[PDB]
Symmetry: C2
Subunit: 101 residues, 2 copies
């Protein structure tokens, strides 16, 4: 089906032990009629999650802005947050650290 | 504001050069009245993106299932896809590779 589409899995590697919590982004699905399946030609495994683990989210794709100082010899972790244009009200900050060249 | 909340940034590091495309997950926002802001006490930068870069998405949080063989000496990349319970129709596969212990 084309209706079901996974956009991505936050991580692409993990221990063969499993039990590792991850998240995947995808298109519309029904939390009551959906499941995740790991598999190979002769093996199949299922992701462990409930309906409460299926969240409606907004995703913003953007290119980072160059940092003020391009000659930094050490990492600089700055703030990143959403900000409304109209009233300029920001969200809580989330860290992102710029790396030297 | 508590209305605006970022759940996460796919990456937490990048070159100070900027221009690096990333994506961030967050709660409800208005694509016409929203913006991303990078900053420090005395500096501010803006994420580069348009309305077409704000997507409504579903995110599923789940724990990976242990792989069949826990004694693998080399990485095994298997398939991962959504599958409907009712009609068992799967989505295209996305790779995920199990790592040895």
């Amino acid at each position: 089906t084309s209706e079901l589409r996974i956009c991505r899995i936050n991580k692409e590697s993990g221990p063969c032990t499993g039990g590792e919590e991850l998240y995947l982004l995808c298109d519309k699905v029904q939390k009551e009629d959906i499941s995740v399946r790991f598999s190979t030609a002769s093996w199949e495994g299922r992701g462990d999650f409930s309906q409460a683990d299926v969240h409606r989210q907004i995703a913003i794709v953007f290119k980072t802005p160059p940092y003020e100082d391009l000659e930094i010899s050490e990492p600089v972790t700055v703030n990143v947050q959403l900000q409304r244009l109209t009233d300029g009200e920001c969200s809580e900050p989330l860290p992102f650290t710029y790396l030297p060249r």
